[PDB]
Amino acid sequence: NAMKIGIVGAMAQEVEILKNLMTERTETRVASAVIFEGKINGKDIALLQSGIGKVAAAIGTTALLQLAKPDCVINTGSAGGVAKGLKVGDIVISDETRYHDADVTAFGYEKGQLPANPAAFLSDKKLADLAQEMAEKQGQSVKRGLICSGDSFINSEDKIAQIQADFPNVMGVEMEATAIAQVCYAFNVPFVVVRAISDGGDGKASISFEEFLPLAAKQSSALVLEMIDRLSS
Amino acid sequence: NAMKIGIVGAMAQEVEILKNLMTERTETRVASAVIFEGKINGKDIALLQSGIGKVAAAIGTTALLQLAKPDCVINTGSAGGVAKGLKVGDIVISDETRYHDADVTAFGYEKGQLPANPAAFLSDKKLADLAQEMAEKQGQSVKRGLICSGDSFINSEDKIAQIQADFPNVMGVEMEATAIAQVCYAFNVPFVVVRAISDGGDGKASISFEEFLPLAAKQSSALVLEMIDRLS
Numbered sequence A: 001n002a003m004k005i006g007i008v009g010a011m012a013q014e015v016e017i018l019k020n021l022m023t024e025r026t027e028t029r030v031a032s033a034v035i036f037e038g039k040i041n042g043k044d045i046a047l048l049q050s051g052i053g054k055v056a057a058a059i060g061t062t063a064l065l066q067l068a069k070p071d072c073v074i075n076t077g078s079a080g081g082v083a084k085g086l087k088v089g090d091i092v093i094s095d096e097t098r099y100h101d102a103d104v105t106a107f108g109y110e111k112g113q114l115p116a117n118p119a120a121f122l123s124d125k126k127l128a129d130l131a132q133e134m135a136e137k138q139g140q141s142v143k144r145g146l147i148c149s150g151d152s153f154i155n156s157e158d159k160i161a162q163i164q165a166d167f168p169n170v171m172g173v174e175m176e177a178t179a180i181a182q183v184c185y186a187f188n189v190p191f192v193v194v195r196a197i198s199d200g201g202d203g204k205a206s207i208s209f210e211e212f213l214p215l216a217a218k219q220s221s222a223l224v225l226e227m228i229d230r231l232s233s
Numbered sequence B: 001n002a003m004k005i006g007i008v009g010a011m012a013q014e015v016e017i018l019k020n021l022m023t024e025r026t027e028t029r030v031a032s033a034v035i036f037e038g039k040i041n042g043k044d045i046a047l048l049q050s051g052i053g054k055v056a057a058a059i060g061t062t063a064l065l066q067l068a069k070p071d072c073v074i075n076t077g078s079a080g081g082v083a084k085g086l087k088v089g090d091i092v093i094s095d096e097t098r099y100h101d102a103d104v105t106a107f108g109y110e111k112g113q114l115p116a117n118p119a120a121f122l123s124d125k126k127l128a129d130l131a132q133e134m135a136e137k138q139g140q141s142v143k144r145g146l147i148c149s150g151d152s153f154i155n156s157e158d159k160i161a162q163i164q165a166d167f168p169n170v171m172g173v174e175m176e177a178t179a180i181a182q183v184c185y186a187f188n189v190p191f192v193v194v195r196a197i198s199d200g201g202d203g204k205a206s207i208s209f210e211e212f213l214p215l216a217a218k219q220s221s222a223l224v225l226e227m228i229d230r231l232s
């Protein structure tokens, strides 16, 4: 079997571009997850449409890894840009992922850390470097750092500040990345976030998100398609 | 073809009583999850030790349903008792589960609701009724109602107050019940929470938990054993 790239998006809109380019595409529904398998530019792809949130992402990534057994997982889609300088369309790549809504400090764990897991899931160095390299060659504005996940859509300066008080270096926020990373950590599969900004996570985040989710999916998908051509075996 | 009962606990202490009563026992490790298969009093059992939290419970429950295909799922273990009158060792049965830490109200979803999911997962009425029948039959103190899950160990009166402000009827809090319910909902498998109080989720919760987690595991597991014997 040749290399198989795993790609995960939460919403239909986040996987629509990659999905519509796959040939010999098969569709398998497992509980709340839809897995597409087929080829893009002669490369085997397993594309997961998980649904929104930590548990939907965990169900779908578990089903993806058990059914398609991809060699790596790239989390594509939209994200809230919390770091200064981020604009809608900008690419955000994860160095690491942490939950902004997990708290077992009552037993000495670091904030965001769940028992039996590292406080931070370290993203795959080689995938993250490839994403930033392809992004620079494409001339796409790109930023690399901490992605914080939680079962919340961040839509206020107060909520942004609460997250920054716990995770000062937080670059982007979304609702599945850390959950996908936890599943990939547990199955020992290389993982990286390659998303694009749809909003600033502030009081105008819901309007911005509705207006720029397509842009974020297009910019995110263009970088992932570039990574697909480079990843061979 | 014979009925297979799925049982889920997050911690080793929450599943050890049931693990130690299984015969013809096999052990399978899938990622962060441990699944024991075998029998208790001649009944087929699939027992999952998932690990703590929503994602660990989701990985584990997904693996459990795909591997063992149990006919139902019972979540055993401990919980913070927030409803008035709850004492360590009391049984809490779920009528429904809701995330106290989910918020997509920015798009008009109900507080605690994730898109493509009901705002609350309705527990299986026949399993909850059986749990309350068996509990009352053994003079076991029992309360039935809303269990709220979150990736947090509740350890202060303020955190309880904020959860109660969002979910006024919250009876108990824990970290996996709603995640297991979401997986069981997605796979269309009947589900119910049958846990026991280890603390009050207040400033003393961590110390109480350390002393009463074992009592909670013993009372929860004792009731799940009564359920196993009656199910068919």
Ligand SMILES: Nc1ncnc2[nH]cnc12
Pocket (backbone or CB within 6 Å): A078, A079, A080, A081, A152, A153, A154, A155, A173, A174, A175, A198, A199, A200, A201, A202, A205, A209
């Ligand atoms: N502001 C935000 N909060 C959470 N997830 C998001 N995905 C895109 N924007 C987001």
Ligand SMILES: Nc1ncnc2[nH]cnc12
Pocket (backbone or CB within 6 Å): B078, B079, B080, B081, B152, B153, B154, B155, B173, B174, B175, B198, B199, B200, B201, B202, B205, B209
């Ligand atoms: N206070 C608490 N918070 C979360 N999970 C618990 N399990 C038992 N007690 C708990």
Ligand SMILES: N[C@@H](CCS)C(=O)O
Pocket (backbone or CB within 6 Å): A052, A153, A210, B104, B107, B115
């Ligand atoms: N399902 C929502 C987005 C939640 S992240 C919407 O379509 O607007």
Ligand SMILES: N[C@@H](CCS)C(=O)O
Pocket (backbone or CB within 6 Å): A104, A107, A115, B153, B210
């Ligand atoms: N590590 C804790 C339990 C996790 S909440 C303990 O040993 O009591």
